[PDB]
RNA sequence: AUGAAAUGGGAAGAAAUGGGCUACAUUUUCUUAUAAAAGAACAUUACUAUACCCUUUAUGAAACUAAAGGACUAAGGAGGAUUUAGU
């Protein structure tokens, strides 16, 4: 049996998001890609360096916004600009988000030497695609 | 298969399509009208309306082919037919007018009548009686009877020949010696019949 | 071969090389030449040709007589004036000299032809082999060249227009040719730059495929001998089929009809 | 901290090969020819031998950057088959999908 | 010290067994060709060694590796029960 990235069935009480519900074979069919860069296109270089930055950028955002992430973040690279689009729960006060945005942007712009912007869409609570 | 089960085997008979409508039996006439609404399989690369195409020889060629080498197997069959035509012309020219009449110089007619002679009618088969298998004489079907004649020919020539002889020279000499019913392949037919004779006692075991 | 028959019946002296590719490939005995140590001698190839040349021109082998003395061995020589048949006889008797008897024969006929004694048809089929490449290797495992071979070198002189008293009839054959494409038939493609320059000015005579009249004549000839034994061959649909598959090519028509 | 002590040894091999690249190029050039006296070539054969062993660039092994796995790595991403499949099967590699055909 | 590092080694088989590769040839061997056609070879080494050995080249600091030639060439003559794959 295949165990890869499959949220298995319980007794109908496990909420799962759209991203979690779909197994790997639905990638490019029902669900898209969380990161969009040009490094895996044919005749393009620096796939390894873009992929390592993604791993870190995801671990950074989880720790910097602990318990405030409704879904996995979406990374969008255009030219040298990096754009982070994160669904965040409305747990923290509003002013705290302004602090963490200023901090996380400046810190990641001086770490990778690129302009990095954070885009936050706040949800009242996690969106449930289906109960499995 | 890449052909859905709704596809129909092609009919590549030139005269059939050009026959007058009234000459066709209504059963044949019915299929033509039905086929206008059906799908038709593409014809094979070896399927043609040629007047020189013989299915029996085309099948015999495929049973000699090794590893998809159709050119070599077809070449060997062409050399065989020629080796038989050249062997009968020599005999015809070196024969009296009376003898000349009997001599057959058509290689296609020597090939067909040679194979038919080798065909075995009844061969032993394993049949289950009381949860036990017995060798009971059975009537061989048409397809199995035809297959056995060709297989026995291609196997006598392939194996039981000198090292320096060639297949067009052993096959020609065997088709000709099976056109007169005096060959090793005919002896193999006489063994299958001889063995069924010994086991005739178990004939009634057959349930069809 | 049609030209060789016309000349043969008028009492010409036929010097017919049946295939010239056989002299540049698949040689199992390749000796060296005493006359010139650079050159090599093909004993078996020369011996076979001489026996055929003897049969064709047996009549003229007593009339023509050598104009010089040829020392085959220390103990054997040909006195001037003796019949040309003696040169041929020694070549067959002693295979070592066979490649040298041929050279004497070609030299004598070329010189004596101009004297008006006889006409000489030098008919070489497969002439493209002379100025091409070989598949023969020296003791060092290095490929030989056509000039090096003795038989090839002698013949290259006979196909030159520096003599008179006869005619040279040449033919090109890509079949059996070495290092040439399957679809090469034109004179420059097969002869090359060396062969073309050697033979010019030459008269090219194109041999085409059977025309409608010739194809019917060939079709009836096979039917006249009972060769086309298939029942449908005599019919108009058989003939039309055989015309398409053969394409009126003489060889292909013979091959297709052979199986039928 | 790197993944393990094996990745640490590999990292040092990569930094000592970069230091000795020009040197090992200039010396090795004197040997890869037939134009210089064999006495010089025999001596250059020992100058290259005398350099430290970790300067040799054939002692570098490509390891997964995240698990330090010596075999199973894909050179375009520098990840093992196990790590690559985890990122690919989650939609985190841009343009990588399963191959159905 | 069950931790860290350096240098040198990690051997072989009158053995059994699994899988693969090659051959046992004539529907074959070699050569040109292009897979068509042609010329030769065709049983003692004819077919036939991706072994051993001998040279050369490629990679490397290191040839112990791989390729290409050279000879040397042994066995094998289509394989007992039995068993694998293919619609
Ligand atoms: K230790
Ligand atoms: Mg560890
Ligand atoms: Mg390595
Ligand atoms: Mg071929
Ligand atoms: Mg070296």
Curated annotation (Swiss-Prot), chain A:
It is found in: Mitochondrion. One of its GO terms (cellular component) is mitochondrial small ribosomal subunit. Coiled coil: none annotated. GO terms for biological process: mitochondrial translation. Keywords: Mitochondrion, Ribonucleoprotein, Ribosomal protein, Transit peptide. One of its GO terms (molecular function) is structural constituent of ribosome. Component of the mitochondrial ribosome small subunit (28S) which comprises a 12S rRNA and about 30 distinct proteins. Belongs to the universal ribosomal protein uS3 family. This is Small ribosomal subunit protein uS3m. It comes from Mus musculus.
From Swiss-Prot, chain B:
It is found in: Mitochondrion. The modification N6-acetyllysine is found at residue 194. InterPro entries: Ribosomal_uS7, Ribosomal_uS7_dom, Ribosomal_uS7_dom_sf. CDD domains: uS7_Mitochondria_Mammalian. GO terms for molecular function: structural constituent of ribosome. Its main location: mitochondrion. It comes from the Eukaryota. Pfam families: Ribosomal_S7. GO terms for cellular component: mitochondrial inner membrane; mitochondrial small ribosomal subunit; mitochondrion. One of its GO terms (biological process) is translation. Keywords: Acetylation, Mitochondrion, Ribonucleoprotein, Ribosomal protein, Transit peptide. Belongs to the universal ribosomal protein uS7 family. PANTHER family: RIBOSOMAL PROTEIN S7. Component of the mitochondrial ribosome small subunit (28S) which comprises a 12S rRNA and about 30 distinct proteins. This is Small ribosomal subunit protein uS7m. It comes from Mus musculus (Mouse). The lineage of its organism: Eukaryota, Metazoa, Chordata, Craniata, Vertebrata.
From Swiss-Prot, chain C:
One of its GO terms (biological process) is mitochondrial translation. It catalyses: GTP + H2O = GDP + phosphate + H(+). Keywords: Acetylation, Apoptosis, Hydrolase, Mitochondrion, Ribonucleoprotein, Ribosomal protein, Transit peptide. The keyword Ribonucleoprotein applies. It is an enzyme of class 3 (hydrolase). GO terms for cellular component: mitochondrial inner membrane; mitochondrial matrix; mitochondrial small ribosomal subunit; mitochondrion; nucleoplasm. As a component of the mitochondrial small ribosomal subunit, it plays a role in the translation of mitochondrial mRNAs. Involved in mediating interferon-gamma-induced cell death. Displays GTPase activity in vitro. This is Small ribosomal subunit protein mS29. It comes from Mus musculus (Mouse). The chain holds residues 132 to 391 of 391 of the full protein.
Swiss-Prot record, chain D:
It is found in: Mitochondrion. Signal peptide: none annotated. One of its GO terms (cellular component) is mitochondrion. Keywords: Mitochondrion, Ribonucleoprotein, Ribosomal protein. GO terms for biological process: mitochondrial translation. One of its GO terms (molecular function) is structural constituent of ribosome. Belongs to the universal ribosomal protein uS14 family. Component of the mitochondrial ribosome small subunit (28S) which comprises a 12S rRNA and about 30 distinct proteins. Interacts with LIAT1. This is Small ribosomal subunit protein uS14m. It comes from Mus musculus. The lineage of its organism: Eukaryota, Metazoa, Chordata, Craniata, Vertebrata. The chain holds residues 28 to 128 of 128 of the full protein.
